[PDB]
C-alpha cells in the first residue's frame, strides 16, 4: 500500500535457486528488471529468478 | 436482366441485328436445336 | 479421395498431369467461409458445438471470381479433396490439366501478381498439418518457377522458418529431383492404428475422417488396382516404367 506523494518502487529478490516464478496481481501492474525500462501494465508475469 | 420475345423467329432476328450478330446467330441456332430436342422429350415424358 | 492418397512427389505430380481443372472446381454453391457457426455434435455434447468455416474443409464453398480464387481452389483441392464454386471460367481453361495451369504459360492465365502471404493466410495455414503444408509449398514452388519468381519464393520461405524446414526439395523443370524425393505427402491411407466409425468435433477433422474411412472402403472395393495380382491386365501406356517421365520435364 502506498500512502506517499507519488509512485514508489518495490524491489523483489527471489533468490537464484528457483527455476521459474509466476507473478499474478489483483490489478494490472508494471514489473521490470533492475535499470531497465518499464513495460505496459499486465496481469501475469513469468520470470527467471536468476535474471 | 434479359429480354423476352414472343417467338424464336423474333429472337433469332433481333440478335442478328446487333453488334457481333454473326457470332450471336451461331449460338442461337444451337439453342434452337436444343429447344427442339427439349420439346420432343418433354412431350414424351411430361412432368 | 484419389488426390489425397498420393504419397510421393512422383504420384502426386503424375495425378495432377492426368486430371483436368474441372475436378478442382465444384458446381455446388455451398456456403461462405470465415463465418462463426454452431454445429451439432451429439455423440459428445447436447448443446451446439461452435466452430468456424474455412476454405480448407472438404465442403464446397463460394469463391471469388478471379485468378486469386482459382488458385485457392486448386490448392484447396490438393490439400482438402474439394474445391470451390467458380463458374463460367471457360471450356478452354477447364480442359487443361491442373499441372498445366500451375506451370505452363500456354494456358493464358496470368498469375504473376499473386502474393503468397495472403494466399497462405486465406487458405488458413495455422490450421493445416504437416502434410497439408507440404502440398501447398509444392503448388507455390510450381507457380513461382512458372512466372520466374524463384527469388521471391526463397525470401518468403526465409521469413517463415517452419515452412523452410518442411519445404520439399525439387526443381520444377527436372525429373531426377522428383524421383529422388522421399517426402510423405499422403493424407489418407491404410492406418496402422485402430480407425473407428466415430465423429470428430471440428469441421476439418470430421471431413478428413470421412475421407479416411472412405479410402478404406475404396481400397477394399473392386475399383482398386492390386498390382501384385493383375499387373498384366493394365495397358502398356499406363504401366509403371522407370523410363516414364512427366511431359516437358
Amino acid at each position: 500500500l502506498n500512502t506517499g506523494a507519488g509512485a514508489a518502487n518495490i524491489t523483489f529478490n527471489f533468490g537464484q535457486i528457483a527455476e521459474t516464478v509466476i507473478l499474478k496481481g489483483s490489478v494490472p501492474f508494471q514489473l521490470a528488471r533492475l535499470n531497465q525500462p518499464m513495460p505496459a501494465a499486465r496481469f501475469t508475469y513469468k520470470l527467471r529468478p536468476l535474471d | 436482366n434479359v429480354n423476352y420475345y414472343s417467338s424464336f423467329d423474333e429472337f433469332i432476328i433481333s440478335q442478328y441485328h446487333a453488334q457481333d450478330g454473326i457470332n450471336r446467330v451461331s449460338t442461337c441456332v444451337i439453342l434452337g436445336l436444343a429447344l427442339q430436342a427439349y420439346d420432343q422429350m418433354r412431350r414424351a415424358l411430361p412432368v | 479421395m484419389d488426390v489425397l492418397s498420393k504419397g510421393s512427389l512422383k504420384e502426386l505430380l503424375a495425378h495432377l498431369e492426368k486430371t483436368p481443372l474441372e475436378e478442382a472446381i465444384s458446381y455446388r454453391i455451398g456456403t461462405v467461409p470465415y463465418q462463426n457457426v454452431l454445429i451439432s455434435r451429439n455423440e459428445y455434447y447436447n448443446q451446439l458445438y461452435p466452430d468456424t468455416t474455412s476454405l480448407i474443409d472438404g465442403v464446397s464453398r463460394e469463391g471469388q471470381r478471379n485468378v486469386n480464387g482459382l488458385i485457392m481452389s486448386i490448392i484447396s483441392y490438393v490439400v482438402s479433396g474439394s474445391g470451390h464454386y467458380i463458374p463460367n471460367i471457360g471450356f478452354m481453361l477447364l480442359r487443361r490439366s491442373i499441372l498445366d495451369i500451375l506451370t505452363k504459360h500456354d494456358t493464358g492465365l496470368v498469375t504473376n501478381n499473386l502474393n503468397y502471404g495472403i494466399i497462405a493466410r486465406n487458405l488458413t495455414v495455422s490450421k493445416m498439418n504437416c502434410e497439408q503444408r507440404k502440398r501447398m509449398l509444392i503448388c507455390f514452388k510450381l507457380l513461382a518457377y512458372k512466372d520466374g519468381n524463384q527469388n521471391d519464393y526463397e525470401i518468403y520461405l526465409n521469413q517463415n522458418i517452419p515452412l523452410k524446414q518442411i519445404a520439399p526439395n525439387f526443381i520444377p523443370g527436372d525429373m531426377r529431383t522428383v524421383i529422388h524425393n522421399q517426402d510423405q505427402l499422403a493424407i489418407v491411407g491404410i492406418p496402422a492404428y485402430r480407425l473407428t466409425q466415430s465423429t470428430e468435433l471440428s469441421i476439418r477433422d470430421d471431413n478428413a475422417k470421412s475421407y479416411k474411412l472412405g479410402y478404406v472402403d475404396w481400397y477394399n472395393s473392386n475399383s482398386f488396382l492390386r498390382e501384385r495380382s493383375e499387373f498384366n491386365l493394365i495397358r502398356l501406356k499406363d504401366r509403371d516404367t522407370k523410363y516414364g517421365k512427366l511431359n516437358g520435364w
Partner: protein
C-alpha cells in the same frame, strides 16, 4: 477466370468493356489499374480530404470576416427600400441575416448560370447554318465529341468540356454554398424565461434556434454549368431550334428545384442528409453498399442498393413523410431496396441533382454485368460526390440519353406534379410550425425564429452583388439579367452604387428587343428604384409595347467599389407560374442578340437619354441619337 484465343475476332457482344477483363483481376501498378475510378465516399482519406478542398474554395471566395463587416451596410440598404408592413427584412435579427446569406450566395450562382446560358443561346443562333450541319452529319460519334465540335464551331469562350476544364474556367460567384462555414461561431440557445423586457428581446433577437443550425450543417448547393447541359441537349437534337429548346427546358427544371431547396431552410424543419451504409467487416466475402440520396435542391430522392453485382434503385417522394419513416411514397421502382441494413453510416453531400443521379443509376443497371463491382462503385461515387463524369465513353453516352429522357416530355417521372406537391407540403409545414410555436411561446418569439417574410428563393426580396471587369473610357460596366420569372405580379428593381468620389453621375441602361431606356442618376449609398415591371401569368412582360421574357440591365459608374441590385415583389408570396417544358420553349421565340450592345457614358449627351429604337441609331455607335 477467363482467357481468349490468339488470332480470334476482337468483337464482343457487350458494348461496355470493363478495364478488368472477364477474369475480374487487374495487376496493380499497370495502366489499366491506374485509370480505374476511385471511391470517394467509401474511402475515408478521400472523403476527409475532399471536404478540405471544398472548404478552402468557399473561404477564399466568401470570407466570414467580410460578410460580418457588410452586415451593417446591408441592413441600412434593406431599410432604404420602403416596404409595406409585414414585408420588411430586418437584418438585425440573427435568423433573418442567416437566410439572406444563404439566399444571396445561392441566387448569385443561379443568376450567373442563367447569364451564361443566354450568351450560349446567342452564339448558337448566330451560327445556325453550321450548327445544323454538325448535328445532322455526325450521329455515331460520342456526345462529348459532339459537344466539343459545337463549342469549337461557335465562339463559346469555354472550349473545354471535360471536368478539369470546367473547373479551370469558373467564376468566384459559382462555387457552391458550403453550409458548415456559414454557421460557424454563431450563438445558439438564448434563454429568456418569462421576460418581455425590451432588453430581453434584444438579446434573444441576436441568436438562433438549434433547428436552424442543423439545417445549415446539412446544406450544399448544386449549380450546373451550361457546358455540362449541352451534352444531354445535343444527344438527340436534329436542329438548332430543338437544341435550344432542350437547353432552356433543363434550366427551367433546375430553376424550379433551386427555388425549392431554399424553401426547405425557411420552413423551419430539419432537412435530412444523404448517407452510405457499408458492412462492418472491411474484408467481407459478401459485399453490399447502400446509398440514400436526399437532394436538398429537389423534390424526389433516390435509394441505390448494390448487392454483389446486382443494382436496384427506388425513387421516393420527399413530401408526405408523416410517419416515422424518412422516406415517402415511392414513385419509380427499379427493384427491391432494403433500407434496414445494419452497418457503418457515412454522411456525404451530393453535388449533382436527382435527375443526374437517376440517369447514371439507370445506365449502371443496364451495364450491371459488364462492369466490375469496383467500377460500378467508383463511377457512381465520383459522380455523386465530385460531379465527375465517367471515363468510360460508352457508359457516358448512355447516361446522357437517360438524362435527356427524364427531362423531355416522355419522362417516366412527371416532375410538375411532384414539384407542385412539394410546394404545398412546404407551406403547410411552415404554417404548422408557426402555430405550434405560437402556443409554446409568444407571438413575438415565433416571428424571431421562423420568419414569414422569406418563403421562396425568388419570392424573397434579395440583393445580388455585381462584379465588373469591363471598363470603357473609365466607366466600368456591371451586368444584371432581369428575368426570367417563375412568379407573376409587380416587381421592382433598384440599384445601389458606392464609389470613392464625393460626387459623380452614373448611368443605367436596360436593353430589350427594341431599345434601351438610358436612365441617369447621381445618388450614392441608397437604392434608386431604377425600373419597375409587371409579369403575366405565362411569365411574359409587355415592355414598351413588346412582349419580353428577359432583359439586360447594365450599370456604368466611375471609380466604383461595389454595385448592388435589389429586387422585391409588391405582394408577399407571389403565386408561381407553371414551369415551362420543351413544347413551351419552342412555341415562342425571343431574340437576345441585342444584349451585347454597350454604350459609352463619356460621350453621352442630354438628348440621348430616353427610350430609343435601333433605327434611330446608325450602324454601331449605340450612344449617339443621330443616324
Amino acid at each position: 477466370a477467363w482467357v481468349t484465343q490468339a488470332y480470334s475476332s476482337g468483337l464482343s457482344q457487350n458494348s461496355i468493356i470493363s478495364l478488368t477483363g472477364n477474369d475480374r483481376t487487374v495487376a496493380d501498378g499497370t495502366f489499366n489499374s491506374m485509370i480505374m475510378p476511385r471511391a470517394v465516399i467509401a474511402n475515408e482519406r478521400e472523403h476527409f480530404m475532399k471536404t478540405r478542398i471544398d472548404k478552402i474554395e468557399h473561404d477564399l471566395n466568401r470570407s466570414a470576416k467580410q460578410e460580418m463587416m457588410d452586415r451593417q451596410s446591408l441592413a441600412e440598404d434593406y431599410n432604404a427600400l420602403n416596404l409595406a408592413v409585414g414585408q420588411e427584412i430586418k437584418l438585425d435579427i440573427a435568423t433573418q441575416h442567416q437566410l439572406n446569406r444563404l439566399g444571396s450566395a445561392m441566387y448569385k450562382a443561379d443568376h450567373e448560370r442563367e447569364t451564361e446560358l443566354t450568351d450560349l443561346i446567342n452564339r448558337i443562333r448566330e451560327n445556325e447554318v453550321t450548327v445544323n450541319g454538325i448535328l445532322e452529319n455526325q450521329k455515331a460519334i460520342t456526345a462529348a465529341e459532339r459537344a466539343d465540335l459545337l463549342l469549337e464551331v461557335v465562339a463559346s469562350t469555354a472550349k473545354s468540356v471535360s471536368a478539369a476544364g470546367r473547373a479551370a474556367a469558373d467564376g468566384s460567384g459559382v462555387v457552391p454554398v458550403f453550409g458548415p462555414s456559414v454557421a460557424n461561431g454563431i450563438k445558439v440557445g438564448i434563454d429568456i424565461a418569462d421576460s418581455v423586457a425590451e432588453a430581453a428581446i434584444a438579446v434573444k433577437e441576436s441568436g438562433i434556434i438549434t433547428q436552424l443550425n442543423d439545417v445549415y450543417h446539412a446544406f450544399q448547393s448544386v449549380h450546373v454549368a451550361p457546358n455540362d447541359v449541352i451534352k444531354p441537349a445535343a444527344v438527340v437534337a436534329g436542329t438548332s431550334t430543338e437544341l435550344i429548346g432542350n437547353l432552356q427546358a433543363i434550366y427551367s427544371r433546375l430553376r424550379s428545384h433551386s427555388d425549392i431547396g431554399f424553401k426547405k431552410a425557411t420552413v423551419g424543419d430539419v432537412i435530412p442528409n444523404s448517407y452510405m451504409i457499408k458492412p462492418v467487416n472491411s474484408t467481407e466475402y459478401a459485399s453490399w453498399q447502400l446509398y440514400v440520396i436526399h437532394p436538398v435542391q429537389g423534390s424526389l430522392g433516390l435509394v441505390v442498393q448494390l448487392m454483389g453485382d446486382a443494382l436496384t434503385y427506388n425513387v421516393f417522394a420527399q413530401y408526405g413523410n408523416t410517419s416515422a419513416s424518412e422516406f415517402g411514397k415511392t414513385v419509380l421502382t427499379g427493384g427491391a431496396t432494403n433500407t434496414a441494413l445494419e452497418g457503418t453510416k457515412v454522411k456525404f453531400q451530393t453535388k449533382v441533382t436527382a435527375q443526374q443521379a437517376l440517369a447514371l443509376t439507370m445506365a449502371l443497371k443496364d451495364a450491371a454485368s459488364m462492369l466490375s463491382q469496383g467500377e460500378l462503385i467508383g463511377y457512381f461515387e465520383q459522380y455523386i460526390n465530385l460531379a465527375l463524369e465517367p471515363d468510360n465513353l460508352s457508359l457516358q453516352d448512355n447516361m446522357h440519353k437517360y438524362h435527356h429522357l427524364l427531362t423531355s416530355q416522355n419522362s417516366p417521372i412527371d416532375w410538375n406534379y411532384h414539384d407542385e406537391e412539394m410546394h404545398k407540403w412546404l407551406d403547410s409545414r411552415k404554417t404548422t410550425n408557426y402555430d405550434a410555436m405560437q402556443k409554446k411561446d409568444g407571438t413575438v418569439i415565433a416571428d424571431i425564429h421562423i420568419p414569414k417574410v422569406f418563403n421562396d428563393l425568388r419570392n424573397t426580396t434579395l440583393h445580388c452583388k455585381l462584379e465588373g471587369k469591363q471598363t470603357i473610357a473609365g466607366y466600368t460596366v456591371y451586368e444584371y439579367l432581369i428575368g426570367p420569372w417563375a412568379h407573376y405580379g409587380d416587381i421592382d428593381y433598384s440599384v445601389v452604387v458606392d464609389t470613392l468620389n464625393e460626387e459623380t453621375k452614373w448611368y443605367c441602361e436596360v436593353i430589350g428587343i427594341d431599345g434601351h431606356l438610358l436612365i441617369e442618376k447621381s445618388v450614392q449609398h441608397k437604392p434608386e428604384k431604377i425600373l419597375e415591371l409587371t409579369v403575366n401569368d405565362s411569365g411574359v412582360t409587355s415592355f414598351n409595347g413588346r412582349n419580353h421574357d428577359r432583359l439586360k440591365l447594365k450599370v456604368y459608374v466611375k471609380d466604383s467599389l461595389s454595385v448592388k441590385v435589389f429586387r422585391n415583389w409588391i405582394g408577399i408570396n407571389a403565386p408561381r407560374v407553371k414551369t415551362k417544358m420543351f413544347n413551351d420553349h419552342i412555341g415562342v421565340k425571343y431574340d437576345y442578340s441585342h444584349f451585347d450592345k454597350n454604350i459609352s457614358p463619356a460621350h453621352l449627351t442630354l438628348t440621348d437619354l430616353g427610350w430609343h429604337t435601333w433605327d434611330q441609331y446608325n450602324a454601331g455607335n449605340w450612344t449617339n441619337i443621330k443616324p
